[PDB]
Design a binder for this molecule. Structure first.
Ligand SMILES: [Zn+2]
Lengths: 188, 597
């Protein structure tokens, strides 16, 4: 009846920083689930709870999709049950995930010679993130036993740090765009 | 909220803000070293100005997490490397002298030239000119001249600076609670708080000395042999029982006796191994050399060079326009950018010194996953020694027939091997007395056991006693010969070369025992041997995260420097030399000299 706008989520030119990861809610529509396989660009494309072929022949109650940018050493933490700054303090997936994490290298776009620092991540938090939680608080981290007074100093750090994306990193430290497809009106 | 937890968080902000500032410096220090332009000279210094300043900012910060409250030793190690407030411990007025001295000394050494009496029209730098004399010339007086005019016309200028140098450097070393500056340098080997693996600074002077004593028999017999061979090239100038004249040793100082090979080849009838010619014919490029070097490391399991290594490294030489420093170098720039910069000619000796550099890169890449501060070899000597064993294994005739650069019609009789071993002895064994002296002279100066009015007295006494080498012209306290050597007048420790030599044969014995090699060690070749790779990598991936005595013991099974593998590598030569000397004199008199006086 209606087509699911997954392209404008994959085809978008600008992405969110991983700490403020985007989420678009796809419902009451129908789209192709194999237009995401013979793309042969996705370095990573692993469903952790479902199967690409079956999806077409199953209808779903809710298809959510999240989009963000992380470094290559960290797309491994966009997987169920892992620990790391990104998965603990920026984007957490549940242990009962039924879905699919799709990624690819974006040096072409997100790396600029001499610096590209637009993308952020949250280095410190007071606790870990409940699954699918989003924390966007630019509030000072009290690492010490000394209060910070909204002022940076000894054992008091600003929580966001900046990704430096250069086009001569290792695949190690290069930018990467991720999409996390989450899962009775969205058919196929 | 304990100090250890707080220290971890501080190190964890330092690890993320340095990985980029250190990458901005490496990234800009590459452009000055590949495009040499006065513009790029400035982008470099600013990047290093930012980096250098950032460290001392963090340095003063780290000190509010005292080690006295740190238990996790990796945490303790990082805080230590960072808490060392270093040369800033002086007054700001003295730090200006110290750095202007170091820069004045450096700019004298690089820019010193001497001009020749019988032709003032021609003047010579050391850089390309005197070094060509001191390597090839067979005329005693010309060698005498380039030796003596350097140590006087340029060595004298460094004498006053060197005094002021020592005075200031001592102030910094004591302030940091080292007894002298030589003691400060010995701290590189220092290990504490780990049982059965500790290692004090004062334990190095003994071990370097206890190990040198087992070198003497080999050296003495190499000395005597080379002397007898020199006593032909210079019939009326050399005494068959006297020290060797310092200007006849093959280069400006005698650091390596490499250039004396033609004047001392054992079986000169035998055709030497030089594959320079087999490469040209099968068409080889710096791409192929470094592709071959890459293959050797993959035959032992190690990872192949990163995609960005092939794209950003400088392997050849545009030349003409752009002006790079062509010293072979290996680069850990940060964030996965590994690069080797070498202006590679199609020689063989440039193919073996590329296996050296990729050894570095292979090593840099193993401990790349460590924390930022713990990214360096286990000690100063570890990192060049990993490279030498790669040249040792690739130079071998067994290896050159694998890759197809040596003819299968090459006969490996005993004579070609004694010829191969002696060329190794001139370099490897030569520099050990030379290196052990030069530090022990400094160690003493910094300890004050040698006054200013006995500086050059006790230098050449030690050249005579320890090294069997004599000056051709008497030198007073107005000279300053030590600082006529590049390491001395640039503020670099030099015992690193002594310990690296000993390590590499320990490493090479092991890796060649796990490759199930049967034969003399000198013919080993750890290629195709992934059991060898795995034992090496296990140490490589540590980095300085473990006490160096444990890294060495991960490979060779011993907690210390060991000469028994060194002697072993050269024993087929040693025994030949002994017979060769049955009617020569072995040793030297401390009080002969080539001059009336
Ligand atoms: Zn090297």
């Amino acid at each position: 009846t209606n087509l699911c706008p997954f392209g404008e989520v994959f085809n978008a030119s600008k992405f969110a920083s991983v700490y403020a990861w985007n989420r678009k809610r796809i419902s009451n529509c129908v789209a192709d689930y194999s237009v995401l396989y013979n793309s042969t660009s996705f370095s990573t494309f692993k469903c952790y709870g479902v199967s690409p072929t079956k999806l077409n022949d199953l209808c779903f109650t809710n298809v959510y999709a999240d989009s963000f940018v992380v470094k290559g050493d960290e797309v491994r933490q966009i997987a169920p049950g892992q620990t790391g700054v990104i998965a603990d303090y920026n984007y957490k997936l549940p242990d009962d995930f039924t879905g699919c994490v799709i990624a690819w290298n974006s040096v072409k776009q997100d790396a600029l010679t001499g610096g590209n620092y637009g993308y952020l991540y949250r280095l410190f938090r007071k606790s870990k993130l409940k699954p699918f939680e989003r924390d966007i608080s630019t509030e000072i981290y009290q690492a010490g036993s000394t209060p910070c007074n909204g002022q940076v100093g000894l054992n008091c750090y600003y929580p966001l740090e900046r990704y430096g994306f250069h086009p001569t990193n290792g695949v190690n430290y290069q930018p990467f765009r991720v999409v996390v497809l989450s899962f009775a009106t969205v058919c196929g | 909220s304990t100090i250890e937890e707080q220290a971890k968080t501080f190190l964890d902000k330092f690890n993320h803000e340095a990985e980029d500032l250190f990458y901005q410096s490496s990234l800009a220090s590459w452009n000055y070293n590949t495009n040499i332009t006065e513009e790029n000279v400035q982008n470099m210094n600013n990047a290093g100005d930012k980096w250098s300043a950032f460290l001392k900012e963090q340095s003063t910060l780290a000190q509010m997490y005292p080690l006295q409250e740190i238990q996790n030793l990796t945490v303790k190690l990082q805080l230590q490397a960072l808490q060392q407030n270093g040369s800033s411990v002086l007054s700001e007025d003295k730090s200006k002298r110290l750095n202007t001295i170091l820069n004045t000394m450096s700019t004298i050494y690089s820019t010193g030239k001497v001009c020749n009496p019988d032709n003032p029209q021609e003047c010579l730098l050391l850089e390309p000119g005197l070094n060509e004399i001191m390597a090839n010339s067979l005329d005693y007086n010309e060698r005498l001249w380039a030796w003596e005019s350097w140590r006087s016309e340029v060595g004298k200028q460094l004498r006053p600076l060197y005094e002021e140098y020592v005075v200031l450097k001592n102030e910094m070393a004591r302030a940091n609670h080292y007894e002298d500056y030589g003691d400060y340098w010995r701290g590189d080997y220092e290990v504490n708080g780990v049982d059965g693996y500790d290692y004090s600074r004062g334990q190095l002077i003994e071990d370097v000395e206890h190990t040198f004593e087992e070198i003497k028999p080999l050296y003495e017999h190499l000395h005597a042999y080379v002397r007898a061979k020199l006593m032909n090239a210079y019939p009326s100038y050399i005494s068959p029982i006297g020290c060797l004249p310092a200007h006849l040793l093959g280069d400006m100082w005698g650091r390596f006796w490499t250039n004396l090979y033609s004047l001392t080849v054992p079986f000169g009838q035998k055709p030497n191994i030089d594959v320079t010619d087999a490469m040209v014919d099968q068409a080889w490029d710096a791409q192929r050399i470094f592709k071959e070097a890459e293959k050797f490391f993959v035959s032992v399991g190690l990872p192949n060079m990163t995609q960005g290594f092939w794209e950003n490294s400088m392997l050849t030489d545009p030349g003409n326009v752009q002006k790079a420093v062509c010293h072979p170098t290996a680069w850990d720039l940060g964030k996965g950018d590994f690069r080797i910069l070498m202006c590679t000619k199609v020689t063989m000796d440039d193919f073996l010194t590329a296996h050296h550099e990729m050894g570095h890169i292979q090593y840099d890449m193993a401990y790349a996953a460590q924390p930022f501060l713990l990214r360096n070899g286990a000690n100063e000597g570890f990192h060049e020694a990993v490279g030498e064993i790669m040249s040792l294994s690739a130079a071998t005739p067994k290896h050159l027939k694998s890759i197809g650069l040596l003819s299968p019609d090459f006969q490996e009789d005993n004579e070609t091997e004694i010829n191969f071993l002696l060329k190794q002895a001139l370099t490897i064994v030569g520099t050990l007395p030379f290196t052990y002296m030069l530090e022990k002279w400094r160690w003493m100066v910094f300890k004050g056991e040698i006054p200013k009015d006995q500086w050059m007295k006790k230098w050449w006494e030690m050249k005579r006693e320890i090294v069997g080498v004599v000056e051709p012209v008497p030198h007073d306290e107005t000279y300053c010969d030590p600082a006529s050597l590049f390491h001395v007048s640039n503020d670099y420790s030099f015992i690193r070369y002594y310990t690296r030599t000993l390590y590499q044969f320990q490493f090479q014995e092991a890796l060649c025992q796990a490759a199930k090699h049967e034969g003399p060690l000198h013919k080993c070749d750890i290629s195709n041997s992934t059991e060898a790779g795995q034992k090496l990598f296990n140490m490589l991936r540590l980095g300085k995260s473990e006490p160096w005595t444990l890294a060495l013991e991960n490979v060779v099974g011993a907690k210390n420097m060991n000469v028994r593998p060194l002697l072993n590598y050269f024993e087929p030569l040693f025994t030949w030399l002994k017979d060769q000397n049955k009617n020569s004199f072995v040793g030297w008199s401390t009080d002969w000299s080539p001059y009336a006086d």
